[PDB]
């Protein structure tokens, strides 16, 4: 009887090859190919969005963490940054935040049939074990990930408008000009789904644990005058701290070859500050005072372009 | 007139919104087969028997006849005394007392183990249509107030 049980598929056909053609055009719209292998040795970096850099024309990612992992992959594997004008290259995907159970996103999607997903926490621990033998560079790396990161997140959640936030942290379509009834309901996503994307951003680097009070005042309908002045004091001390980090970092840019992991983290905060089109007091400060930091972050990038 | 000093699944079943006896709290199954649940069996001039148990995601005996209980697994003994319309009762596990108040339109109860376990189950029926349920779980030593409230209206 058990012998008869093993043979009961009396025919098994070939797998199935018909594909949704509209899906495979959307993945082609969001993929950015890392230039310069088999089918399984290729990873895919999932980022938040992609901005076109004005100078080198490369397709950089819009978060200071997504751009740091992208430059650290270009250095470890000897790649070139993708071109904003898109044979089994690697890739860079524009994903949503919701392609994880963690809802935070740079991720890494390695391989095809044995496909392993490295989350944000697993990536940020991989990139932290590369500097762990130097005890001093671990100090500055913890500083840029805590003091400068908390300043940048608060300027982009609170000080910038929702048209500025969803430009940087969403894969939805940009507004442009509302001429179509499609564009009315595309504009209605960035008004409806703005606060829900802002909330998932504040769960990435334990920002919800260092700043429990200004994240609790986010998830609400009406914020009163008392929460608006407590938040104004927290943001203002996060910014005065962050001027001191940026002013002290100007002495630490002496490079002698390929850039270390701290120089790829300084250069990834400056490149996503100076992409913000609004005067959010970080772009005002970096464009005016830290002119030597803007020039350093362009010099760091142009060993990853072609 | 049976209850097991029923604090379990009667006052911790009231702290969530959820979704020969044969007792079963069978949640659901799979498309292959699973239980997710409970199965209880049992077995004269006294009230006795022998039970089983199986859970997923225990064999003992019975002796009952004021009413005293009994249970000897791989062991529980309890009692329930009748006093007026206000009641009493003690139990032990190998150790808490019972405070049943079955008086009409205000049927509540509480218990207290010789530990930091204080569980009061207030249940007020102040109108013939509506009902209130206060579920106190004041654990003083483990410092948690696991209280719950409730209401039920109908016109």
């Amino acid at each position: 009887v058990k012998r008869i049980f093993d043979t009961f598929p009396l025919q098994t056909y070939a797998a199935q090859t018909d594909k949704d053609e509209a899906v495979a055009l959307e993945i082609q719209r969001r993929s950015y190919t890392f230039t310069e292998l088999t089918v399984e040795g290729t990873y895919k970096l999932g980022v938040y969005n992609v901005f076109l850099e004005a100078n080198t024309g490369a397709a950089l990612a819009t978060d200071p963490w997504c751009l740091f992992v992208q430059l650290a992959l270009c250095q470890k594997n000897g790649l070139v940054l993708p071109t904003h004008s898109q044979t089994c290259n690697h890739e860079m995907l524009v994903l949503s935040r919701l392609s994880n159970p963690d809802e935070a996103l740079p991720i890494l999607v390695e391989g095809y049939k044995k496909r392993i997903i490295r989350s944000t926490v697993a990536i940020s621990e991989i990139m932290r074990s590369r500097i762990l033998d130097d005890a001093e560079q671990l100090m500055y790396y913890t500083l840029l990930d805590t003091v400068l990161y908390d300043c940048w997140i608060t300027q982009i959640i609170f000080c910038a408008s929702d048209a500025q936030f969803m430009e940087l942290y969403s894969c939805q379509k940009l507004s442009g000009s509302i001429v179509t009834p499609l564009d009315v309901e595309n504009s209605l996503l960035q008004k409806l789904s703005a606060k829900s994307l802002k909330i998932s951003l504040t769960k990435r680097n334990k920002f919800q644990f260092r700043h429990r009070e200004i994240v609790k005042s986010m998830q609400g309908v009406y914020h009163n005058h008392h929460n608006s002045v407590n938040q104004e004091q927290v943001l203002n001390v996060l910014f005065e701290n962050s001027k001191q980090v940026l002013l002290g970092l100007k002495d630490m840019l002496k490079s002698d070859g390929q850039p270390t992991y701290l120089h790829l983290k300084i250069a990834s905060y400056i490149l996503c500050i100076t992409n913000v089109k609004e005067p959010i007091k970080l772009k005002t400060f970096v464009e005016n005072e830290c002119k030597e930091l803007v020039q350093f972050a362009q010099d760091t990038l142009k060993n990853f372009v072609q | 007139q049976y209850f097991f000093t029923g604090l379990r699944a009667d006052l911790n079943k009231a702290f969530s919104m959820n979704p020969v006896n044969v007792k079963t709290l069978n949640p659901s199954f799979s498309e292959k087969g699973e239980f997710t649940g409970v199965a209880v069996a049992s077995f004269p001039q006294l009230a006795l028997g022998l039970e089983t148990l199986y859970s997923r995601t225990g064999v003992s005996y019975l002796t009952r006849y004021w009413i005293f209980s009994g249970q000897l697994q791989a062991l529980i003994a309890s009692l329930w005394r009748k006093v007026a319309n206000v009641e009493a009762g003690i139990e032990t596990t190998l150790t808490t007392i019972g405070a049943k108040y079955e008086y009409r339109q205000s049927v509540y109860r509480g218990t207290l183990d010789s530990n930091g376990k204080v569980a009061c189950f207030l249940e007020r029926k102040v109108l013939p249509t509506l009902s209130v349920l206060f579920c106190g779980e004041i654990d003083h030593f483990k410092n948690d107030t696991k209280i719950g409230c409730g209401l039920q209206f109908e016109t």
Partner: protein
């Protein structure tokens, strides 16, 4: 500058449940230098024990004459150094970043583990810590602030830390985490001057003063001496009790007014102002 530093202690000292307050009383005591009093002159240490004066719920607050509240030890110390040698020195212009980086590393990596020992370790929280909030707050709120701080530390320590085999697994990965973190701090501190006391040394030594001052503190003193020897633990502990046994002449202390006490009337008003 003119303000009122609000802390967590009672009577004459900071409480052991907050290593940012013990490091801040030591900071203000150790300002004896000419230019290091200039940033402490008129600070008015108040032991208010109520968190509802803070901008973020933590209680080293510097409420400074305007509502300009700076909270936490690292933000206060960086504020006072902006408004500018034995016993507390001011770092050089060339070393303000490394000394800020060592403050931040103790605040996020080492103060996480003292937060674990003060509310997670079941021997310390039961015998010592849960009985310590009875004498800092008032009668109705003896019961929520220890459980809230215990809940905040569990989310902060679940990522590297977590029935006899269950608990001794936790004390092995804690001890691997503390030994890794103190070695990172000691190798990075040894880039500045060594014979001098900085603001980042007072926050590290206030973590040892709490972790070796708990009922489970005897294991850690044996475990730290297995890595760093006795010749450093007997050098650190001799700098700690030097700070505990210092005169309080530099503190310009105060009593909390009837706006800062955390009474039942003055915490239902501050609860009502949050909505």
């Amino acid at each position: 500058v003119k303000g009122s530093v609000h802390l967590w202690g009672k009577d004459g000292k900071a409480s052991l449940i907050s290593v940012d307050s013990i490091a801040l009383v030591w900071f203000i005591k150790l300002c004896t230098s000419e230019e290091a009093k200039s940033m402490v002159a008129g600070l008015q240490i108040v032991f208010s024990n109520n968190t509802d004066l803070s901008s973020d719920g933590k209680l080293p607050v510097l409420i400074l004459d305007n509502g300009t509240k700076v909270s936490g030890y690292v933000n206060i110390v960086q504020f006072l150094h902006k408004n500018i040698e034995e016993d507390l020195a001011i770092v050089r212009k060339k070393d303000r970043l490394l000394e800020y980086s060592l403050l931040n590393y103790v605040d996020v990596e080492i103060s996480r583990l003292t937060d674990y020992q003060l509310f997670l370790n079941t021997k310390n929280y039961n015998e010592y810590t849960k009985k310590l909030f009875s004498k800092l707050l008032y009668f109705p709120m003896w019961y929520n602030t220890p459980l809230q701080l215990r809940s905040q530390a569990r989310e902060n320590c679940e990522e590297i830390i977590g029935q006899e085999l269950q608990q001794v697994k936790y004390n092995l990965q804690f001890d691997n985490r503390l030994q890794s973190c103190v070695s990172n701090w000691l190798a990075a501190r040894k880039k500045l001057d060594d014979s001098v006391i900085l603001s980042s040394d007072l926050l590290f030594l206030a973590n040892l003063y709490v972790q070796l001052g708990l009922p489970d503190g005897n294991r850690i003193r044996s475990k730290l001496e297995q890595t760093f020897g006795s010749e450093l633990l007997n050098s650190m502990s001799n700098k700690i009790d030097d700070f505990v046994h210092r005169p309080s002449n530099n503190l310009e202390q105060r009593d909390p007014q009837f706006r800062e006490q955390g009474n039942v009337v003055m915490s239902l008003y501050n609860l009502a102002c949050k909505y």
